């Protein structure tokens, strides 16, 4: 059995960048895929990227494409975030997943999540 | 590799005390003698004086000190060369100390000898210096070992034939 | 296998098709990912039985215990004399086994290929094979994966 | 290359009463001499069996 | 001292070593001098070494 930790809730002033951490119980050397998902409050889902495995390839949806960059420490068995820019559309919740295999296929395991609200 | 030296002069070291060391257990091409690197002292015409020499190393590699307390068996032959029932033994020095005492007592027969003589050793940095005292049961240093290090060297147990 | 690809990604093996319904790269997901995993395991393990819990604070001895420091030093000199050569040696053999471990995967693939590509498909060495019938999108994948329909084809024969 | 020789081996001695010097300095010093030869067969009896298959 | 506590206790003491015979009796009186301590598991007895030493 394994369990998917994420950093703690974070507040940022607009126009700032954050930074979330998500790591997995146990974290030895790894290669499962992972991703990101937003939350808007009282919204659906709604799909950000991923890493593949040890390949380490990277892919973002067209809506930014430049503002959400994640890279993969997998000997930590880590994923990270340096999402930038940010806005009031932006207030929402992140999660981070994982597929179960080194592609960026659907995914069954979840972390706690993070709120991440932005105002001064 | 060393560099054997005279720390203390005969002639000119004790010019108050006997210098001549006799001892049969030590004998040399089959008569009295005695150890090369040390001395044995006594009291001339009755009298020990009290002897204070010190040794300065005025050399940049240290110097290997040999000293050793003489143990009589019984107090015949302790009055009989120091004329003092009791005598003590001091060296001292920049980090090193330590006071003997001479333990008189009949010993079982080794060597065809009764009293014992122990010996002891201590090393001088450059620049340092040694003060010795005593007022009987002494064995003076007469040479002294100044060593240089050096890397591979060691000791070996062997028969094998030189070649 | 003469040669390895750069313009494939997502995957250490995969194959390739020059069909008129298009012409592009594509991975073996089943295999790619199954070697994955022992190579996982694999370092996994040897950082497990590489344990480093321990004391390790350095002692000093005076003068007169020449004999204690040289058999103090000889101590630790002779562990980590002995831990360099394990590290080495268990790092070094291990890779030769993965070198080896991705050779057999390839090689057998491109044999469980053959199996379910009969000699409808005219092999021609160089890591390929030359098709006797037509095949669309729906038959190249059928040899990509685990299903094949070869008595359906009997061009030429 | 990895069987690396440079070291002092000169042997000590100790008195009577450090007889629990002679007896932990004896282990040490018999304690790397069995761990050199299992690593020194284990090493060449390994790779021989690779080179057999290799050639 | 009795130790009233629960953890151990390091306790220090220092014994004066006087050049000569003139400070050894203008400091305490005694050109022979002892001093002693003594625990339930530990005692030993110690004396001045009163000699010139180098400086
Ligand atoms: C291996 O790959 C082949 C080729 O991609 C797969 O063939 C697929 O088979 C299914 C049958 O379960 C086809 O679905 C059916 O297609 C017909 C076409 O007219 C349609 O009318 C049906 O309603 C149904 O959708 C599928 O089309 C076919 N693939 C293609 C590209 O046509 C095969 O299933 C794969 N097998 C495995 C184990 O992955
Ligand atoms: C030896 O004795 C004489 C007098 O008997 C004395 O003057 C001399 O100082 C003594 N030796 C030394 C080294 O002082
Ligand atoms: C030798 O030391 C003793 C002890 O104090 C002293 O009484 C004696 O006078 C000293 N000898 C000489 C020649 O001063």
């Known amino acids: 059995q394994v369990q998917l930790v994420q950093s703690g809730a974070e507040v940022k002033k607009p126009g700032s960048s954050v930074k979330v951490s998500c790591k997995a119980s146990?974290?030895?050397?790894?290669?499962?895929?992972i991703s990101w998902v937003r939350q808007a409050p009282g919204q659906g889902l709604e799909w950000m990227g991923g890493?593949?495995?040890?390949?380490?390839?990277?892919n973002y949806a067209q809506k930014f494409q430049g503002r959400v960059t994640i890279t993969a420490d997998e000997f930590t068995s880590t994923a990270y975030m340096e999402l930038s820019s940010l806005r009031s559309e932006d207030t929402a919740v992140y999660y981070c997943?994982?597929?179960?295999?080194?592609?960026?296929?659907?995914?069954?395991?979840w972390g706690q999540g993070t709120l991440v609200t932005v105002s001064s | 590799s060393f560099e054997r030296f005279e720390i203390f002069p005969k002639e000119s070291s004790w010019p108050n005390h006997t210098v001549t060391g006799v001892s049969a257990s030590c004998s040399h091409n089959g008569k009295s003698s005695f150890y090369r690197n040390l001395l044995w002292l006594t009291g001339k015409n009755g009298l020990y004086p009290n002897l204070s020499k010190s040794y300065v190393n005025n050399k940049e590699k240290e110097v290997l000190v040999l000293w050793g307390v003489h143990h009589p068996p019984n107090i015949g032959n302790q009055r009989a060369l120091y004329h003092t029932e009791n005598a003590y033994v001091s060296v001292v020095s920049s980090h090193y100390s330590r006071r003997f005492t001479p333990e008189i007592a009949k010993r079982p027969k080794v060597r065809d000898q009764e009293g014992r003589i122990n010996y002891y050793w201590t090393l001088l940095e450059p620049g340092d210096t040694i003060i010795f005292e005593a007022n009987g049961n002494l064995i003076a240093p007469w040479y002294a070992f100044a060593l240089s290090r050096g890397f591979g060297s060691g000791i070996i147990t062997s028969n094998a034939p030189m070649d | 296998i003469e040669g390895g690809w750069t313009g494939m990604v997502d995957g250490w093996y995969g194959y390739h098709h020059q069909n008129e319904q298009g012409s592009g790269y594509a991975a073996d997901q089943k295999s790619t990912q199954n070697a994955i995993n022992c190579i996982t395991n694999k370092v996994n393990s040897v950082i497990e039985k590489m344990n480093t819990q321990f004391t390790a604070v350095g002692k000093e001895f005076n003068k007169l215990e020449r004999r204690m420091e040289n058999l103090n030093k000889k101590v630790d000199d002779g562990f980590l004399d002995i831990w360099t050569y394990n590290a080495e040696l268990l790092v070094l053999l291990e890779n030769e086994r993965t070198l080896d471990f991705h050779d057999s995967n390839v090689k057998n693939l491109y044999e469980k290929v053959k199996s379910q590509l009969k000699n409808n498909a005219k092999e021609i060495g160089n890591g390929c094979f030359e098709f006797y019938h037509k095949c669309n999108n729906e038959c190249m994948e059928s040899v990509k994966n685990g299903t094949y329909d070869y008595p359906k084809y009997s061009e030429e024969s | 290359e990895k069987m690396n020789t440079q070291f002092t081996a000169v042997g000590k001695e100790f008195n009577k009463l450090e007889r629990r010097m002679e007896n932990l300095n004896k282990k040490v010093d018999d304690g790397f001499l069995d761990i050199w030869t299992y690593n020194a067969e284990l090493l060449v009896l390994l790779e021989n069996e690779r080179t057999l298959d290799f050639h | 001292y009795v130790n009233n506590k629960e953890k151990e206790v390091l306790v220090l003491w220092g014994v004066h070593h006087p050049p000569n015979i003139g400070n050894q009796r203008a400091l305490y009186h005694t050109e022979n001098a002892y001093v002693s301590v003594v625990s339930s598991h530990y005692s030993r007895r110690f004396t001045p070494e009163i000699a010139k030493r180098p400086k």
């Open positions: 146990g974290g030895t050397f790894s290669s499962y895929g």
């Open positions: 997943a994982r597929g179960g295999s080194y592609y960026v296929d659907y995914f069954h395991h």
């Open positions: 890493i593949i495995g040890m390949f380490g390839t990277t």
